[PDB]
Design a protein that fits this description.
This is part of a larger assembly, with two copies of chain A, two copies of chain B, one copy of chain E (about 80 residues) and two copies of chain F.
Chain A lengths: L1 H7 L7 E2 L14 E2 L17
Antiparallel strand pairs in A: 1-2
Chain B lengths: L1 H9 L12 E2 L2 H10 L9 E2 L3
Chain E lengths: L5 H7 L3 H15 L14 H10 L11 H13 L1
Helix pairs in contact in E: 1-3, 2-3
Classes of the chains: A little secondary structure (about 50), B mainly alpha (about 50), E mainly alpha (about 80), F alpha+beta (about 230).
């Protein structure tokens, strides 16, 4: 189902694409998996522990 | 974990990667060749090493 | 007041003045090591990955 | 909203009580950032009282862990609402779905 | 020298003595005000002593003669 | 020598936001070098105008609410943060917004000035629910580059500000996203030259040609410390 | 418009080829941009002179070995590749070398004219085994830019060259090595800035500091179409 949904969205089946470094600007040797992930902001702040 | 992965990745060999079998006069031009993109990182080459 | 002079004094107060770093629990003798401080804009202790 | 969820966010958000759920269905009559009023439909009007509800939102309030709590209206003027329907999003909800 | 202390020990003969001799030097190097025999080159008081024992100008045998000649000439001046 | 020089030949305008710029001819390897340098410059050092200070009547802080306004003051400031404004003459502009009635409030309701250009007049900014509800707002816009949080400006400026001078973070950079690709240029006697096509997407307030010209000028200025200073 | 101009601190030269130049202070992110631009220019478009074709009598191809020389001809090709030659007057140079006798041969023994300079006449090419054996060859020196290997030049020259010609990778660019690091700059009001440190290795015939100036000049003269 993930593969069909990626095909529907005009995205690679394997789920990885080639990225270019922001500093030097050349394509990385191997495809790198990139997608959207649900991050969380935990209560362990840094100024509360400083 | 990261240092060993990088060193393992770049101390490899492939059968027909790029610029295989070419002879180089030192590690300096090996680095310049890799940076210019004319030679792959895993390429069986002959290098004069002191 | 945190004037500029206090930082101009700090950058040379810390230099060549080692500072110990401790990570509880200190299982062995290596849990305490001394590092030469470097001043950073931030809030977290930057640690060398090799240690 | 989490793009990849499970489907029970809609359940936990309304069962937590941090959102303003409509007791009786009706049509929204006037909202602010603090108040929501609904003119209940004639079929839920008891013959004794006016039959118009008030939903007084709770604005920025201290938590037990020193975090903000507010509710913002997720509805607009003059649109129908149903019984058991969300009206104002909670501290960490998006259109009635939990969004941590 | 400045990052490592390897060549100090051969001039010293031990490791636990290098800290003692370096602190003993830095005492009158900082509060005594006497000019260090090693150059300055923008260093701190606790590391110029380490460089000096790196190049090994001072030793415990000779660290106790220049401080007695000074006091004996002091008493000669008094008397 | 055999060197050739890049020339700006085509400015293809997909829309008011998306732009295509073509640069040719380019020699071997220069396409990626110039493209990456231009991309790093354009994404970091383009000047622009952004809302920085908002004043609203009857409001003391940004954590309060006003009757008749559907959303909160924080939502108002976040909507203001995405205002695309272009100023020609001066560098600091005070904008005035007055509205009364029922219905959405857009950027078109700002009292327009001769030297201020509003890119998006349909960009909604506030919602009013009561007919008697009225909102009067003073908006202050400066010009700058980069991203300026709310701490640096208060640290730098030592004068006292009256209660109600709401400070918002400024994202001066108008460029949102750019990308480039290199193809083969067509020359009858040279079938090896390359052509650089740089895609630029941003709000208004920046003409793509003037942005690329500014990036080239700043790159040359930076190199001036290398041309003759060893 | 209020950008800060770096003040070049110093250049550290370990030798006449090894150099290290530090730039401070630089606006945030400009260190990487300038370092990449300079490195690409150095590795791509530095004009220079290098040997490309060597014709040796008595050898048919690379695997073939001449008698009387202790080394194979692959090391001969490597040693020829590692030659720094400056040609000022004209642009195409053909050189012939003839030597004999016991002892290593060197670049000093090649027949030279006024408009060809070699920074290392002591550079060793081969060692001879007996005085009876004689070494004679003709080599081709061209003027060009960048770095082109032999693999991309065999197909370029479709003419059937006489068998015995040997192709050598042409290192026109005088830069042996270029590397750059970016570290944090120190301004007590501006901790955001960064600094550049550039380490360069060149061969002879070019001052390592001069290579930086040449790269800056070429980049500026290529960008001057958009300054005004």
């Amino acid at each position: 189902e993930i593969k069909e949904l990626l095909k529907l969205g005009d995205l690679p089946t394997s789920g990885q694409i080639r990225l270019y470094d922001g500093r030097t600007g050349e394509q990385f040797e191997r495809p790198v998996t990139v997608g959207y992930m649900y991050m969380l902001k935990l209560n362990h702040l840094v100024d509360d522990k400083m | 974990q990261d240092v060993v992965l990088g060193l393992y990745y770049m101390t490899r060999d492939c059968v027909n990667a790029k610029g295989e079998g070419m002879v180089l006069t030192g590690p300096k031009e090996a680095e310049r060749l890799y940076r210019s993109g004319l030679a792959s990182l895993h390429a069986r080459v002959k290098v004069r090493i002191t | 007041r945190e004037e500029a002079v206090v930082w101009d004094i700090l950058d040379e107060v810390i230099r060549e003045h080692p500072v110990l770093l401790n990570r509880a629990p200190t299982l062995h003798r290596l849990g305490i090591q001394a590092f030469e401080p470097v001043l950073i804009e931030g809030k977290a202790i930057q640690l060398h990955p090799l240690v | 909203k989490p793009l990849v969820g499970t489907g029970m966010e809609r359940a936990v958000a309304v069962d937590s009580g941090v959102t303003a759920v409509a007791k009786r269905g009706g049509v929204v009559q006037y909202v602010d950032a603090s108040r929501i009023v609904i003119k209940v439909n004639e079929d839920e009007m008891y013959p004794g009282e006016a039959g118009i509800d008030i939903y007084n939102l709770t604005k920025y309030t201290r938590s037990n862990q020193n975090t903000c709590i507010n509710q913002m209206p997720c509805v607009s003027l003059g649109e129908p609402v149903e019984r058991g329907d969300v009206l104002a999003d909670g501290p960490s909800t998006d259109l009635g779905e939990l969004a941590l | 020298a400045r990052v490592t202390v390897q060549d100090a020990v051969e001039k010293i003969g031990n490791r636990f003595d290098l800290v003692l001799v370096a602190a003993r030097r830095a005492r009158q190097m900082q509060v005594g005000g006497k000019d260090p025999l090693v150059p300055e080159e923008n260093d701190k008081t606790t590391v110029i002593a380490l460089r000096e024992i790196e190049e090994g100008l001072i030793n415990n045998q000779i660290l106790d003669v220049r401080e007695r000649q000074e006091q004996q000439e002091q008493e000669a001046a008094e008397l | 020598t055999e060197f050739l020089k890049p020339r700006l030949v085509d400015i293809e305008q997909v829309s008011s936001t998306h732009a295509k710029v073509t640069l040719e001819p380019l020699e071997r390897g220069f396409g990626h070098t110039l493209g990456n340098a231009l991309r790093r410059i354009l994404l970091s050092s383009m000047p622009g105008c952004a809302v920085t200070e908002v004043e609203i009547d009857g409001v003391l802080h940004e954590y309060s609410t006003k009757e008749g306004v559907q959303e909160d003051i924080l939502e108002i400031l976040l909507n203001l943060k995405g205002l695309a404004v272009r100023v020609q003459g001066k560098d600091e502009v005070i904008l005035t917004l007055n509205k009364s009635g029922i219905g959405p409030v857009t950027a078109a309701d700002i009292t327009h000035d001769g030297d201020v250009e509003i890119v998006k007049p349909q960009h909604v900014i506030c919602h009013l629910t009561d007919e008697n509800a009225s909102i009067s707002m003073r908006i202050k816009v400066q010009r700058g580059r980069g991203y300026v949080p709310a701490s640096t400006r208060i640290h730098s400026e030592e004068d006292e500000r009256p209660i109600g001078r709401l400070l918002v973070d400024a994202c001066y950079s108008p460029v949102e996203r750019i990308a480039y690709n290199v193809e083969a240029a067509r020359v009858e006697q040279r079938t090896d030259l390359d052509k650089l096509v740089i895609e630029m997407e941003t709000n208004g307030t920046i003409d793509p040609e003037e942005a690329i010209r500014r990036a080239a000028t700043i790159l040359a200025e930076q190199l001036e410390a290398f041309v003759d200073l060893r």
